[PDB]
Amino acid sequence: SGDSDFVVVANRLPIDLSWKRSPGGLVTALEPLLRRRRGAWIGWPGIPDSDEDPIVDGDLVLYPVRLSADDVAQYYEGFSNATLWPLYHDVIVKPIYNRQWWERYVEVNRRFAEATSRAAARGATVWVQDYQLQLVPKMLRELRPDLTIGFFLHIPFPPVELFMQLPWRTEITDGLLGADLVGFHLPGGAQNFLFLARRLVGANTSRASVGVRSKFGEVQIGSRTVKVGAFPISIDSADLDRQARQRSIRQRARQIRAELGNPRRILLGVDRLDYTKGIDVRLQAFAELLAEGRVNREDTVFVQLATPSRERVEAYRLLRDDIERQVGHINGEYGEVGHPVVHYLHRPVPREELIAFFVAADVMLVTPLRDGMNLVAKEYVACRSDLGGALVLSEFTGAAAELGQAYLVNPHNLDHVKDTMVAALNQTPEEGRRRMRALRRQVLAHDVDLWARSFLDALASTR
Amino acid sequence: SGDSDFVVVANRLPIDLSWKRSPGGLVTALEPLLRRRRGAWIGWPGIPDSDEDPIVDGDLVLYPVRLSADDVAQYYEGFSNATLWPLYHDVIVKPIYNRQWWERYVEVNRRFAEATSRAAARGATVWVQDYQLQLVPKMLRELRPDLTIGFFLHIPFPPVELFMQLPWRTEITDGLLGADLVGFHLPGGAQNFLFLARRLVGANTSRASVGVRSKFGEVQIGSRTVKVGAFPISIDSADLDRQARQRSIRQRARQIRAELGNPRRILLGVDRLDYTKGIDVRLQAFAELLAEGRVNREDTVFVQLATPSRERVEAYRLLRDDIERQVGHINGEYGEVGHPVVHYLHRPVPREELIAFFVAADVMLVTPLRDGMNLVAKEYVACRSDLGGALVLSEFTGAAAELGQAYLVNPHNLDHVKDTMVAALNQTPEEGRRRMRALRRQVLAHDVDLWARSFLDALASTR
């Protein structure tokens, strides 16, 4: 019946493609828990039409979920990325409502639930991850009412006015309510969920504000209670802090500045390419600052590192076209031959190279239109043990709830985005250090370990 | 100092362009109150660069507000229609954030406040109308703290996640909080407003659900309390009921059906042209039903009457192009020469002609994506004293909160929109009558008089 007493369910297995374990991430965050539990991980291995035979990793048992390329297209590229993703992110792009996508999403979700049941021992603890798998908790509780089930959403949970658009709004809500604990990064998501529970499902809920890792909400579902909480994700702050101190990284950061023609100021953007990330906004702000002579085109350069994402989704292709136009435009207007003012890469950057960029950057531009947390904001902070740099951060990130000492911006307020970029570029050394010290105190004290433990303690208490 | 003890403030004066009073509307709803008060109306006369000399109407004193064509472009076509309107309607279209529009909106709002102060006697009651004038209550209270000020929003008040986009979010919120009473059509708007008050402004508010014309919310603003309520607007039900019974109207309805080639079923759409109104959705549903042979192209016709709106706003021009494409397409595919399946007019229809269409229509299609109330739903119901017809109504209207006996649809769920249109077309006489009787009981009992009195009683109680 499966001999795992702790099970993680996520769209992907924690491996890279023969194959090896992916570095960092949740799987590393859960390392010391797997040392005391019989742990399993359920997910798609990332290859189409694979076996579903369990793979032993010593520390982990991997249960591959079989998906065809067609399953992936309709469940993932379709329903997950082109229905749920834009809807949950404040419909920045118009969601597509497609019944064939929904039906595949249901099937695939069931397949994940079945795989989980195979792995899970009696009374096992299950942690379901993220928006692609919102039906699993209910499906799992129906197959296996003995299980303790947690669910955490890594993206925002939208306001009810928007969520209601979903023709399958009730099925998704019922899906989440199959969990013992439903967690979000922010109290706002939790409160939206409680309100949805009363409005759409008619369940009795708690009415108080939801705290951070405390003051939990409750939804009554017949005989049982669903716990609702906010657990803001973070990074392995100490590890990144240590990694950024390496001599090789610091020398690379110096070499990067030399390769850029030794600018006095470097702005940096690091993003998975997504319309949620507000890359177009920072480029527009930068172009207008150059037009206004408020940024010196001779000693200031912007580096944007976009890692490719969701190429088969038309909205992402269109966003890529817009950004790339902006890059060519800005350089043609304000650059010189042999000296761009914008450097842009559309590719995955090796982790040590990326860290060197964090170390090199005088201003980190993290300006999403809407983002669940955004780890890049926290990664930059963790890397600046030298206390240099400046973080310009959108209010519409979960990170802005913790990183209040950054230069916060409303990305829709372009005038203030521009004022703020100038302010960050021209800050005094002391003021820069004051902010970075405060940000680091936060990020170092609130790491992924605290997050993981807080969620699992909450989940454990529902027993 | 002005000798009016009751003052209405709205973007437009209640006149038609020399000039005469506009029929119906709020000005008719307030007729018996003006018989017992010295009443004034403040608004733009609809002509550019006019005098601001008061005009006596016997029952009313009209205070024209001077606006230039440029004022109208930036305050109205700009900020009101291309910033606030799309934002408040769940960003169906992308709002434009423009500082020049904001500054004009502020100036014009101040000009309205000044005009109000001129007209208003000491201790006068003021009722400010709608989204173009959200700054007036605060501006007015600053000029004239002796006044009792009510404000009613005729469009939805969006969720906080969306409202927060507005770079001038705080100024707008402070603006509304200048009122003694802030009213919305729905509890949902009221509750969004209270939540915004706590989150953005930090004011202490009530935490309970907001009732309908009862169980009011409260926002504490220093020394004074702001009342927050839901007052769902309606029509002069009895008057429209009476008007629809005229012999001439009923004969016209018969003649309309003959001019349409005597179809067995007529579907009707009546809308101010707006992307909020979901005209594209009903056309898509109709086209697919015809493709699927689920509607008989030989005996069923759809009439769409769009009255022109906001021609200088690009989004409205684009929507008009899309709808008109759909019309040509559907007729080219399923019509015959001499017999369209879709009749479409882009023009204002005389009121008696419009009522004849309500009487003629077997199915009323009211399918907005998002609408504050939508009066057309209620007008149709009021017209069907014969108890014929069927109302297909979007859940995303304020009207759907009262007209639950209609055929309710999620307009994003196209499959169900299509199922519902077939069901309404093919309903039994008895089932049709059962629904229409129940709808009429509601609409006849809850008219614009009840709405107006409920709001003003609430406003009066803040003294």
Added chain:
Amino acid sequence: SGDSDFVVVANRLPIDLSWKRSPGGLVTALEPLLRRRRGAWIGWPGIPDSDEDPIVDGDLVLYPVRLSADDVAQYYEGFSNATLWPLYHDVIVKPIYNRQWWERYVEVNRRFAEATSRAAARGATVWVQDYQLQLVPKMLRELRPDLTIGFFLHIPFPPVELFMQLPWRTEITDGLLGADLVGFHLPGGAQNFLFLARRLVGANTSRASVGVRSKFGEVQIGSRTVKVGAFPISIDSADLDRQARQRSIRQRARQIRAELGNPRRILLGVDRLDYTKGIDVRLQAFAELLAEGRVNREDTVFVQLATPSRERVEAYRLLRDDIERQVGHINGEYGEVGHPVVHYLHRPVPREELIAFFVAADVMLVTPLRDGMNLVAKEYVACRSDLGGALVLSEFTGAAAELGQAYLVNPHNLDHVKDTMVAALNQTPEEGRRRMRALRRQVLAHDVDLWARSFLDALASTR
């Protein structure tokens, strides 16, 4: 070796899909020649992956060419319709240059040549039809130097400045030069071909103007001479004339006018849907005339009958969208419920119904941007034995070279298109008759029989 002494090669067999002979067309025009020759027809049967076994029709032997759906996509929808077609029609739409399309076009052309060789007896006469098969004459002469080969292009032959764009310009030119006779509708095409022969291929040609069915051009290709001529295609004028006189047709024409609400004037457009046909132009002209009050929206109606074409080619889908927008727009602006000013059908009209429309129409609108001949202009004329009606005809048709008594227009000169439509609508009975009599004298004397005989006499003389 095949026992046919006269062979027609065309993209399609002359059949309809079991199957029966297509009415009218070239196959009917060649009926009395097949009575004195052993005739064969080579072409695709219109079904994918068919046999290539000959089919005896008594009067004809049909040699089916096997094509896969992929062959059709790349050779026909691709190279023929999306490379050659827009290029030859003055690049109204941007040609797509695709090497995979070219290679398939070559393969398919070879397959046609092989099929021809199978059917053709020693010394047989072969008539290759149109732009999809321009490589066949050279390929055929290489396989079978005993054959007499004619080729006729049914579309315009573009000026050299445009033809030169084609990366495979030389291969196409060499292809055509494989024929003993290369014929075009117009001297202009013939002269373009001669000039191309000198410029691109370097062959010695004649330098005189090319006559109509006379004064032929010559291209010297080593040992042999290629004849170049103009043979303007026509219709079976006498048959259509006779058909239009039927009592049933005339009664249908009257019934059509009654079904249109008995307009005083009917304008008609009849076209295979194509961006070459200038349907968008006549709609624009009509809309502006209505806007200007120069056409009476109360007693004048426009009927447009578009038969579907090339749905898998994006440019045709886009044109359909534009036209259909125009239709919806014009009706929404100038129509009434129950009375459109534009009736539009996107569907094949039965031949007797179409003829009834020709008979009913007061003004025939034939306004292509560029058209090889356009048979509709001549069909209308043939149908008006009552001498009623008016033909408005684009100068950029081959038909305008013969139908000079029509109301000729430059479709790019919209002001004059509009003036001309008013003039045609309001012509005196006598002036209308004078033009229609002259047009009919032309069309009745120059029919498809004269065309076919003239081409084949020219082809025969090369022996």
Added chain:
Amino acid sequence: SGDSDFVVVANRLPIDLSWKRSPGGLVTALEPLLRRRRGAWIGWPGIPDSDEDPIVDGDLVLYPVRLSADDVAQYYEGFSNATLWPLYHDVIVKPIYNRQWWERYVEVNRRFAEATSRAAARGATVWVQDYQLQLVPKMLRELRPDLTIGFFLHIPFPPVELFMQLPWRTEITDGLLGADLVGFHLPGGAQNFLFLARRLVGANTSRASVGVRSKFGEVQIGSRTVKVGAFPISIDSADLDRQARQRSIRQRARQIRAELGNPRRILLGVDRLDYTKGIDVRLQAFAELLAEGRVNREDTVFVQLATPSRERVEAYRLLRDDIERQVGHINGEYGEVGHPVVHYLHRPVPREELIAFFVAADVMLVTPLRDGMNLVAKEYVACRSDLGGALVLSEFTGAAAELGQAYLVNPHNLDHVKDTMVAALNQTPEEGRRRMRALRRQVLAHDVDLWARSFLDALASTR
């Protein structure tokens, strides 16, 4: 009556904006003729609403033509740049036919003719320049039949099938026929003009091919004959040759290569931004070569220098957007931070800097879709006295008729454009020198002086 016996008429005066004479160009080419004649120049000074008082330059008398910003918009940006320009260049972009533009073009042309008459002495020689002023010769001959009038078109003269689109085709043709000599860069243009003369105007013309600076064509216009010829424009080859040899230029070329990260190969594009210039084609070719690994992204760089043009014309803005997208795209895909594979400037480059780029570039990419001559091809050749470099040149330039030793390409044949770019990048030193020597022999022997003298000798012989 004006005391100038030689008069140049062009859209612009030969000055830069107080003001000074523009370097190089036609005005320098005509320097030794002005030393023996009383010369005048008629044109717009480039400022709106100026005086028309003559300005003495000692060597020249400048007659400013008064134009308002509105005149410029409708005559120049409108008719010239958005009607004639796309039409004459094979409708790469769709011409706009606008009667208001035409009427302004007529008025402005008349104003130029009047200014000319003011300056011109009895029996004076007049040289009218280019496509904005095609009506002047007829207008001038009507005012002043004593004048000898030449006209030269600097852009291609399109084939008749395209020219015929122009609603004002006859007025333009009559306009040109007002000249004693009409000259084009190429025999092809001359021959198109003769054919147009016979077809549209019905004039008797010569029928032979038109030679280069010889074997002239003739159009008979009543009593007088119009000479038609081909005079391919060139540059001051010797001066540019000398200029490129300067030590400072050669050092700058070396410094440019160092600033580019010392690539082994530099490709260069230099163009006035125009959709005729095929900048999008070379970028596409370069991107695909990089994708295919046929160009080394580590040691090969492309520099594109676009100088801004016609910003108020939407087609030019759209082309700029497309190019700039391509630049950003290619760099994001194949560049490195600190090392773009494409450098792009949208700005006027100082002449000495531009020459340094010619000297630095290993491959010159001159790939227009259609261009009258293209001087950049010849400028590059003149600069390479070191015999290094390679010229990749579109067949669809007038320059390709003289520069046959370059690497000629059909820009529509992208496969061959790509093959050719690889071939040019990888040519042997010797083969490179062989081509460059031959090209230089041509360009050095056929300079702007030969062109100017040949045209004026032809013009003089019509006396």
